[model samples]
Structures are given as structure tokens and as C-alpha cells.
Target: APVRSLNCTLRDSQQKSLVMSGPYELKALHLQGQDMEQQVVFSMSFVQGEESNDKIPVALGLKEKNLYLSCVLKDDKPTLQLESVDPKNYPKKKMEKRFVFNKIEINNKLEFESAQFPNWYISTSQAENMPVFLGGTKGGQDITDFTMQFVSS
Candidate 1:
């Protein structure tokens, strides 16, 4: 309720625009198999200047089937730099995938360690379960939600 802020723009196919600001909102969580949905597919807030309003912590966990997430943003408050996930398209199941972002310099805190596969046995397993439900194409092919304006020099 009332947490909707976005304004992203990253154009470059001759359209010409390359960057823009945002209200900032790129929250996403699709921990497939048992389902832990928190989808706010892309938002940049609203373009202006002096961009940097720290509050970035998106997480999704699973090892076996592979759905590890770790999008962190905290430049020098305590030291963090792991941004972006959903790589290698994890979703087979067993356990190995990892997404860790630990920045706790006394209190600048930003901590997350994910290890999936235990949501009521992946939702009373028959085959696929444990917070799993990304979307078409088995959740791959550059799974698109939207918003990513990045043209800062």
C-alpha cells in the first residue's frame, strides 16, 4: 500500500536516451517450487540528480533446483557490491547454488544467506516444488519483468 515508485529509462538502439532516474523499485522474488511471491518488476523512482537512496535488498533462495538471488546495493556504508542474480537458470533441485551478501561493519548491516529446498517438501512433492513458479520458458530466456535505466557516466 503506497509503496509504488518507479521511473527507469535506458534506451539505446538509436532512440538516443541513455539514462534516467527513478523512485527506485526493483523488488523481485520468485523462489520456485513452493512459491514465495513478492513481485515488483522494475521501477526507478523518478529521474533527477544525485542518485543514491540506499534500500536495496532482494533475495531468493534455493540450491537444488537453482533459484538463488542476491541483489545488494550499499556503496561504502559498510561495503557491498553483489548486484543481480537469476544466473544459470537454477531450477533442477538438490543443492549447491549460493547467493551471499554480508556487509555488517558494526551496524551498516546488509546480510543474507540463502539455501533453498524445504517448503513443506517443495509443496508435497510429486516432482517440482519449493517456492518454484517463475514464468514461461521455464523462467529463462532473459526472464523479463521490466525497468533498468542505467546510463551514468
Candidate 2:
């Protein structure tokens, strides 16, 4: 397990690439082939435990925004939230679940299941251009599966 910078497209089946828009909002939109189009870039770093005690736990960050992508409980439901912090100052208690994901790979596609909420996934909407949120298996045509195209390490 190693740490690297990945400038890539997390494009869903609808061909929407996850993009950071507004003031730190995560959303999906069809990428315009412009010189300065927005796209999701993850600084993927290895952590410990949750999958046979290896480096399966990972913290995904919005590298451009310097924010950590985390799943936490809001209104008693798992909600995707963004926090700004250095990794050394990342808060932990009974909350490693809040900040880490068990990166599950299926058929070369990536699924980010919340380390806190079982079966809850980081998903995009069925409709075009929407916020990236956490959802279970109920939302029709929820884009949970993503293909990662690596641009750099």
C-alpha cells in the first residue's frame, strides 16, 4: 500500500465525471473537453485495518480543495461530508469509520462503501448533474459503480 496523487475521471455509466463545483460541492457532470474542465482528483493514502487488518482503509481527499471526504451520521443517517484538515490532525475516536473507506473493487470498477455505514455507498444521481451523496441500494439506477482512469500517481 502506498500514497499517490491520482488525477482521474470517476465516470459513471451515464458518462458523468465527478467534479468539484461551487464552494467545495461534489457533483457529477459530463466533462467538457476544455483545457480547464473540472474533474475529481484523489490523493489516495493507505491506512490500517477494516479488511483483514491491512492497508485496506483509505482516506480519499479532494486534492485541489485540500479537503477530506468522509461519511458521518447526520440526522441518524450516513451522510457524505467534506472536512478540511491535515491528515495528522484528522480526528479519530470511535470514528475511524467516519473518515475511511473500504475500497472495494469489483470487475475493475470501484465501489466506496462507507466504513461506518454498512452497504452504504458514495453514489451519484441517475439524472444528469447532481450532488454526490451517500445512499443505499434503493435509489433507482443509483450510480454506485465507477471506473477510475488514472492520469498520474
Candidate 3:
């Protein structure tokens, strides 16, 4: 498949914003099944060049029971928000360990211009699916992966 590009600006509930430019791509695959109808949650933590770290929680991406993409923000800022959604859902017992992505690109290249440790994690339960962390288990493991990208407008 061809690489996906996102020229997006992100904002948190607190009104903090970050703008991302160039070409970017994020691909995630289920560790167990091909079901994409399940409700998936996404969270991102941003670190400012060894200065400080901030967590942006987005609840925009919610698949029926399998996959979701973040919501595209309006302003040109690097936002940690929900993006998209896949239509399939899977049984809780049939869930897997992780969902891996192919790669994320920036400015039509594999290089990330600024951001680091673009972490992506998913959850099964909808009640606890928000930008904030919630305690308790849904009988599955919370899997995550990392990479870098640029922060631009």
C-alpha cells in the first residue's frame, strides 16, 4: 500500500496546540486478528527537545469494536487527538497483544522533522477510553510502539 500523509494541527482540551507539517504516515495492525470493527483508543505523549514532556489525550478515534483513526484538527498545530476509525470489532477473548504499524512519513519522506517518541497505544473498553489514563484491566494487554516526526505548521 502507498504511504499515508497527514498535514495536521493538534490541540488538547486545555487549548494547547502543536502544528505538524510535511508528509506523515501511521499504520497499525492487530496482533491477533484482522477485525477492524472494535473500538480502539489512541493516546500521544509529546516531549519538547529534552525540555519537558506533555501528554495529549484525544477521544476522537473510536472504531465500532476494532480500529480507529484520530480526528483531524482545524488549526495548524501538532495535536494529540483522535484521528480515524475502522469498521470491524472483535471479541474481548479474541484480542491480541499489539497492533503494529508499517511506518509514518513526513514531507513525502521517512524522516520526521521534529517530534520524538510518537507513542501509540490502544484499549478495548469504551468507558475508560479517553485521553486520560484509567486504572483497571479489560482482560487484554495494552500494547505500544514509538517513532519520531516533525512539529511544524
- State the weakest 10-residue window (summed lDDT) of model 2: 86-95
Residue-level lDDT of model 1, residues 41-144, one tens digit each, is 22222212222344232223321222333322234222111233344542222223233212111133222222221111100111221122212131133221
- Who wins the TM-score comparison? 2
Query: In model 1, which runs have C-alpha deviations exceeding 4 angstroms?
Result: 1-24, 27-73, 78-82, 89-98, 101-153
Clashing pairs in 2: none
Question: Candidate order by TM-score, highest to lowest?
Answer: 2, 3, 1
Cα shift from native, residue 96, model 1 (Å): 10
Each prediction's RMSD over C-alphas, in Å, is 18.8, 3.7, 17.4
lDDT of each: 0.24, 0.70, 0.26
- Assess the local accuracy of residue 12 in candidate 3 as a C-alpha lDDT between 0 and 100: 25
Sliding window of 10 residues with minimal summed lDDT for model 1: 117-126
> TM-scores across all candidates?
0.17, 0.80, 0.19
Q: CA lDDT of 148 in candidate 3?
A: 33
- lDDT by residue for model 2 (9-75), tens: 5677677787777665788877777823666677665666566532267777666656878888889
| TM-score winner, 1 or 2 | 2
